[PDB]
Design a protein around this motif. Sequence first.
Motif: not given
Lengths: 59, 107, 145, 145, 163, 48, 96, 132
Positions: H90-107
């Motif tokens: 799922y690396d090719k989906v645009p903006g994925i690095q922010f989503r991955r960041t956001a959840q990580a940040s949340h926990m």
Amino acid sequence: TTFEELNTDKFLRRWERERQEMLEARVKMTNDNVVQAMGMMDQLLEHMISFRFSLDQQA
Amino acid sequence: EYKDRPFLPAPFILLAHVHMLFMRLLRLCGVHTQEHEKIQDDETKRKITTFEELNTDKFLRRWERERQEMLEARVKMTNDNVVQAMGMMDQLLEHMISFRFSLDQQA
Amino acid sequence: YYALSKNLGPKLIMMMEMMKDVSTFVFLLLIFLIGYGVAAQSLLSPDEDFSSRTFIGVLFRPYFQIYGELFLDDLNSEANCLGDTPFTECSRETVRMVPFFLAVYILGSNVLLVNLLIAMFNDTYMKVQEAAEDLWRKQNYELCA
Amino acid sequence: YYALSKNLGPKLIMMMEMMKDVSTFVFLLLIFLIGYGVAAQSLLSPDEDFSSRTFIGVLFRPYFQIYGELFLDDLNSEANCLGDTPFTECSRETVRMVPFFLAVYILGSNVLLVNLLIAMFNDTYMKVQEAAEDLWRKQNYELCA
Amino acid sequence: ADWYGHLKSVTSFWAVLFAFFFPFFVLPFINFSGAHRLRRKFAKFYSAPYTRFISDLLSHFVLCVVTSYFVLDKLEDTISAIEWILLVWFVALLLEELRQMIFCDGIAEYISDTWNRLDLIMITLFFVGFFTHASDPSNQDSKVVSKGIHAFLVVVLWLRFMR
Amino acid sequence: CHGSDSHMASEMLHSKNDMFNKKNAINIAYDAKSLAFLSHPATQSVIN
Amino acid sequence: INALVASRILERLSTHRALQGPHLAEERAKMQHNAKKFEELAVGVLGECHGSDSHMASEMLHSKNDMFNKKNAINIAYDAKSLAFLSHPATQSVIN
Amino acid sequence: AKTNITALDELPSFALAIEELYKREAKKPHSHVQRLVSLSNTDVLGRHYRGRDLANTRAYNVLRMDQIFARLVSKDFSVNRDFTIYDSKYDKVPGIQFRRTAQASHMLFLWAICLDRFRMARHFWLIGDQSI
Ligand SMILES: CC(C)CCC[C@@H](C)[C@H]1CC[C@H]2[C@@H]3CC=C4C[C@@H](O)CC[C@]4(C)[C@H]3CC[C@]12C
Ligand SMILES: CC(C)CCC[C@@H](C)[C@H]1CC[C@H]2[C@@H]3CC=C4C[C@@H](O)CC[C@]4(C)[C@H]3CC[C@]12C
Ligand SMILES: CC(C)CCC[C@@H](C)[C@H]1CC[C@H]2[C@@H]3CC=C4C[C@@H](O)CC[C@]4(C)[C@H]3CC[C@]12C
Ligand SMILES: CC(C)CCC[C@@H](C)[C@H]1CC[C@H]2[C@@H]3CC=C4C[C@@H](O)CC[C@]4(C)[C@H]3CC[C@]12C
Ligand SMILES: CC(C)CCC[C@@H](C)[C@H]1CC[C@H]2[C@@H]3CC=C4C[C@@H](O)CC[C@]4(C)[C@H]3CC[C@]12C
Ligand SMILES: [Ca+2]
Ligand SMILES: [Ca+2]
């Protein structure tokens, strides 16, 4: 999401300025600044004594 | 007030009164019964003493900081500090005149 | 259905807040009502067997005399005083103390307790007005949901 | 013509401001008046056809009982209770609940609602006194013009 | 914490009142702080100040209700049974007031309190009224005068229940 | 948010978020018992 | 008069249909701010005038100015809905 | 160590890193985290059911802690996690690095709220999204 993040940054900038414009904060900074001014001068006197000696041993 | 008062309610308090009179008569004239109580140990007493002294020191430390964080105190210190800064500079000028003379007589 | 209005909704929460002061007033009056009522009913009829009518006489007039309806004509008829002056030429001299007891009672209930409730109500209103407004704003969502 | 005076003019603007609190009081009482009135009129006359007189009976006494005029002698005559005690020896046992309902009602209207209006009036006065004075000063020019 | 004694602080007025009224049915199933357990819980529960206040309130409330019944009901041609019960009750109250007078910080400290003043006024009013009735029990005038003094007695008693 | 663009702010408060059991910001605010948030004019404007 | 008109124009523009819109909000706040400042100026000079010479100040408030449709300063103040100006004692003295 | 639960094996490496931060902070004396997890009376995955070895060696996992915080908000609050986004497909989906960041940040945010460290909490709250 973009709107919410921007406005979060805008509130933090406005919040930081407003807290730095309070009377207590200004008195506290002013207080720290006068202390730092002495420290600097104190370093300056340390230098002037060193000069005095340089001319003293120069005579 | 209600700690030392007898338990029996009012109509039946006469029984409590005659019981207290009987104990007083038996204690003063008869001298047969006595009083029993409980005394706290030295360990728990020193524990209370140690706790109280610590908390006294803690309140004094918190009290001193809080009084030094007031606006009036900060303005007053700042005021004394600027005066001390002049005094120091004044000493510094006294030195610079002495230097001026050293070079002056040096020429 | 008044709760949706901005003018009435807070006032209904405010009304539920005052209910405690109303309860406080009821507990303080109850003392004077039962004391005056038992005393006055006994003074008016000192030679009557206790019945349910005695109990109704202890609570009926005393409660309604605190709203300004003073049953002085009815009290005069019940006291068996035949004089032109309301409490004079009576069969028993003790029943002439009935207007005085009453005189103390309405001083206790109307002049003292009612004015004290006005003071509590004013104090309570100033204390819980902002909280009532905030609680109405939470109940606005609750009603919408 | 009272508006030119410095003492009365602001008080007339102040009066127009309180009218909203008076309206709030009317809406809150209306609930207790219609509830008590329908209940009390039905209890007094449980075997009568509905007519215009029934409606007049539901609104007449309840409204005037909140000003201290308690029609207890009239209620006693209408209830057909023959006893020396006001609500006793009645034809129907249900009509003896009429004084209790009344007992609740004037607790709701006089002790609770009237004192609440006193509290609103005091609050409203303190809030809009300076604005009323300013508005009177604008109306001074308006009247001069 | 001193008020509730050796009992848990979450106890309400109704809970302590229910436990007071029903000792064997609410006490075992409660948490506090066999013979040496039931006896320990009683000895702890009734020694609590709160329990003695509650006992004093109820006692004074029954005194008010019975004395109120006595003044409303007609007086008999001899001294009635309820009158004798009230006589024993008010002597007991008088002895309790004397005990309070002796075990205090002086007569002035005792008489400064308004509730103590109310206690003296109610003992004084009752005996005046009782002796007025008991001087001539079959006399109609004596019964009328006795009920007249006892009207004041009921007023002071209901005032003292505010304590 | 309400100072910058009131309509978009309303859209954000009405937005259902998947991370929290498909519930908007007012539902979580009510569940969090945040009286200060609920009494705010922006929140009241969305509720109206 | 110019300070009162300035206050009215900024306050009414700040609530005008061309500045009405969800995004047109910060701008709006600044105007209201500027409006009150100008209002403050109009009150302040008026106060100074009444402090210096009360009779001449009354003469200025009664003066009809040709530039604004032959109307005095109180008429423009009433038209500008400046409650602060109308409640001032100098203004009230002229009205009396 | 490997776990028989399929939910636990799906967890990424960073989740195990937070689990290590919870474990390391938890071993200190009179720590409120241990009392909070013990008094909850729940199993390892946070479900309210009250073998023993997994339930004790990995007692400070991220899913259970999510469940504890969920019970502390309200009775029907349920945080939805999606770790499937951390796979390499799922690396090719645009903006994925922010989503991955956001959840990580949340926990980590949640971890920083639990240990009452306001400065990192404010920092992880700023890094992520859904600020209010
Ligand atoms: C201590 C405070 C409450 C004051 C007490 C005042 C009492 C004792 C006074 C006030 C008014 C008095 C009454 C006034 C007039 C009469 C009529 C007379 O033919 C017999 C006595 C009688 C019936 C009095 C009895 C005593 C009385 C009730
Ligand atoms: C300002 C106020 C407190 C003034 C005081 C008024 C008092 C003293 C007045 C008001 C009503 C009066 C009573 C009215 C009627 C009677 C019945 C009569 O047979 C004896 C006196 C007696 C019992 C009066 C006693 C005095 C009295 C209680
Ligand atoms: C729940 C709150 C409002 C209290 C309710 C109290 C009600 C149920 C009580 C209070 C007074 C009571 C009345 C008092 C006396 C009588 C006379 C009796 O011969 C028949 C019952 C009757 C007519 C009672 C009916 C029930 C009654 C109206
Ligand atoms: C401080 C206040 C609230 C004290 C409470 C007073 C209440 C309990 C009193 C005041 C008036 C009383 C009523 C007066 C008359 C009657 C008619 C009778 O046939 C049955 C009882 C009944 C219906 C009474 C019930 C109790 C009552 C409502
Ligand atoms: C401190 C307060 C309570 C004192 C009260 C005093 C009371 C109990 C006393 C004082 C004066 C007394 C009255 C004096 C004279 C009479 C006339 C007599 O034909 C009937 C009794 C009657 C009416 C008495 C009733 C009781 C009385 C009112
Ligand atoms: Ca006593
Ligand atoms: Ca952010």
